[PDB]
Amino acid sequence: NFNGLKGTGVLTESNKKFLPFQQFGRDIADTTDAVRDPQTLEILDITPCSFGGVSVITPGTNTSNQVAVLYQGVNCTEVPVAIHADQLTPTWRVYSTGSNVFQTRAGCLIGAEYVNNSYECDIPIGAGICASYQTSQSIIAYTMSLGAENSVAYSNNSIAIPTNFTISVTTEILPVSMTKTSV
Amino acid sequence: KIQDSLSSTPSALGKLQDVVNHNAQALNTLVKQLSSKFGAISSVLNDIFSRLDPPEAEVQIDRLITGRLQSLQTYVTQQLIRAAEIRASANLAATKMSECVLGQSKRVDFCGKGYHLMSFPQSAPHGVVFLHVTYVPAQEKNFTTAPAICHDGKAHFPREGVFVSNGTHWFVTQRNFYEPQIITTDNTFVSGNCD
Amino acid sequence: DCTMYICGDSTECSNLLLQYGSFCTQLKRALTGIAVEQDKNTQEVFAQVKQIYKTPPIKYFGGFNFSQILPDPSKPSKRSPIEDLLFNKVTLLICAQKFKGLTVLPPLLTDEMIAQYTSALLAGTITSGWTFGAGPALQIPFPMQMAYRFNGIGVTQNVLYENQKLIANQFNSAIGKIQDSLSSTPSALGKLQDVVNHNAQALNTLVKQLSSKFGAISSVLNDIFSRLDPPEAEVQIDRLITGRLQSLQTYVTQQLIRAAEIRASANLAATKMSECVLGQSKRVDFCGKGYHLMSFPQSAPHGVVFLHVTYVPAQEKNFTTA
């Protein structure tokens, strides 16, 4: 509430130079981001707190009951500020502290362990990660692969010619019309 | 294997499944929205005319008239956009069934992955299912190749084919099936000198 | 998130939006449908093949020069030289201060794997030709995948072998000129600069309306609850609620119309990387102006750049015909 401004945020310092008469501070999006302290003259800063959503990574409910969780845009070094584990159950605090912690540009998911092997994708995660249910009774979050490497041996006098064929039948499906209605 | 595959994987007819699921959800959300309040007293039109004095009541029912009007306007607008992406696919089906079925198409990866032979339309609920019969090469063999050949000071070129060899003899064959032949004038046309 | 945009950290404002009922769910469900589809749009274009073909370790592709397009290991971001500019001319505070309910989800495919698919399409179109898009990828030189691409024109194969080096030098000089022309022209990446500008313009107009009265007395939520008794607040915060909800419906409805023309252009690029790239097209003025030879796909931020090669007849004469 200092300097006559109500709001929430984090009061830290920055490298600015206020004018001798300037008091507030505003940005392009018209929000407060730099407030000068009335009692002591220095440069402060205001940053937003927490935000982001969650995503319940689950397999089919006929195969498991335990689930993972994903924290979008939250650094793992400051999750319990954005988790606020004082108000949360220790069942919910399993996804707050523990050995299974992972960081990526998409977020900081927890409840799943990274595995070094790479194969096909099952559930997308974000920024190049896929999750799958591999047993036992746990969810892994591996790195998505794109396929194998053929590594064709190019040469100036090498030609490959097929000597046999196969006839295949491919099925493709298209909508033509939706249901008519009137009101 | 086609009959077994559609009756096995349950995502064979997913595309058309979402078409009837979206429309069923759209109507269901529209019906449940008239139970809302929109800041008024209640969703029943009868009680407002009973308890409220008449000129004020007219004010409170202005929420319900424009609240349901915004619900129909939102619903109609979604159907206008959704009919555009179906007509973009109805014109794609009318293009495929007039080219893939009633002729042989040379547009790569349009009528089935590979070289296209025929097609077979089948009728599906609110859609169509094609059966793109295609062609796929199987087994490859290495060979040694040359871009031309000259017999008496003048280069020779394939009429239609690629010159290949297997170590000691040179052959001309087709480009998608191995069948060697003997080099004659019917396969070669002369051009220039081989220097 | 509907709740946080319309109302701030106010507990009583959450119940007022709940009275409207089920309006916010449609907004999130529509927006995911776009966000899932955007990750789908990349898969139909760049992922036409599954086996990631390795680039050849040896240069001198028959006499041509592909240094400008094929990736350079000396770079610290594994990209190609022409692609190197394309990531600098296009521009994109910028993404940090928008956190007022909105967010920018990261794409599933990053700039590295997209740069590998492009490096996989390029490595197959050189040593195999059109086969690698119809079955096992065979192998054939590049001074031949060119002579079987003059055969579709009708100019036959005598034009390439004979007088081979000038066509090598004409292609080498043509790829040298395309680097300079992209640098100077103002609108060279015009079609991709305005795409990232329009989304920047759309979000900025959406966030600038949070400080508007909309017919009320002030745009602050918690302060006007204390300056006014309860009946009036309800008889005024409906205006701010119906103001921002109509202002967020306008943002969503613009995106479905805008996503309906990117999908109209993703399918045009999915049918251009599968006919010009994986073959030779005879559709006139489709794969470059004039008679078509081949194409070379290149990536760009939120887009794709095709590099067509065409054949244009030149000096002409007069003759008497029968």
Ligand SMILES: *[C@@H]1O[C@H](CO)[C@@H](O[C@@H]2O[C@H](CO)[C@@H](O)[C@H](O)[C@H]2NC(C)=O)[C@H](O)[C@H]1NC(C)=O
């Ligand atoms: C070309 O491939 C087909 C299969 O794709 C071969 O057909 C098989 O031939 C073997 C022995 O001749 C049989 O045991 C199999 O039952 C056949 N399969 C089918 C589906 O009929 C065919 O022989 C190959 N031809 C050549 C010349 O190699």
Ligand SMILES: *[C@@H]1O[C@H](CO)[C@@H](O[C@@H]2O[C@H](CO)[C@@H](O)[C@H](O)[C@H]2NC(C)=O)[C@H](O)[C@H]1NC(C)=O
């Ligand atoms: C390359 O293929 C040719 C044709 O299939 C082979 O030539 C024949 O070889 C058999 C067995 O050696 C002889 O009985 C025929 O008379 C040959 N045909 C002619 C026209 O001469 C040749 O042997 C193959 N080369 C290799 C190294 O396998």
Ligand SMILES: *[C@@H]1O[C@H](CO)[C@@H](O[C@@H]2O[C@H](CO)[C@@H](O)[C@H](O)[C@H]2NC(C)=O)[C@H](O)[C@H]1NC(C)=O
């Ligand atoms: C392919 O083109 C590149 C780009 O011009 C050539 O690299 C140049 O090589 C010359 C001398 O070899 C140098 O003076 C230039 O500085 C190089 N350019 C760059 C950007 O480094 C390369 O030599 C060409 N290769 C072939 C086979 O033609």
Ligand SMILES: *[C@@H]1O[C@H](CO)[C@@H](O)[C@H](O)[C@H]1NC(C)=O
């Ligand atoms: C329900 O259980 C069945 C039985 O294994 C299996 O298909 C799956 O676990 C569940 N079904 C779906 C559609 O997920």
Ligand SMILES: *[C@@H]1O[C@H](CO)[C@@H](O)[C@H](O)[C@H]1NC(C)=O
């Ligand atoms: C999270 O914070 C650590 C240090 O606290 C930092 O090294 C890391 O880069 C951060 N993650 C980001 C910015 O994604």
Ligand SMILES: *[C@@H]1O[C@H](CO)[C@@H](O)[C@H](O)[C@H]1NC(C)=O
């Ligand atoms: C497994 O993955 C972790 C995470 O990067 C890595 O530090 C570790 O070296 C990997 N293990 C092996 C054997 O490569």
Ligand SMILES: *[C@@H]1O[C@H](CO)[C@@H](O)[C@H](O)[C@H]1NC(C)=O
């Ligand atoms: C490349 O082509 C030339 C053309 O005659 C040939 O001499 C050379 O052996 C070829 N390179 C390889 C590795 O075969």
Ligand SMILES: *[C@@H]1O[C@H](CO)[C@@H](O)[C@H](O)[C@H]1NC(C)=O
């Ligand atoms: C023969 O063909 C295979 C492709 O199946 C290739 O890997 C191999 O290098 C080829 N060998 C020669 C000697 O051309």
Ligand SMILES: *[C@@H]1O[C@H](CO)[C@@H](O)[C@H](O)[C@H]1NC(C)=O
């Ligand atoms: C060919 O056409 C006429 C011949 O009568 C003449 O203008 C000239 O020779 C030629 N015109 C051209 C090349 O424009």
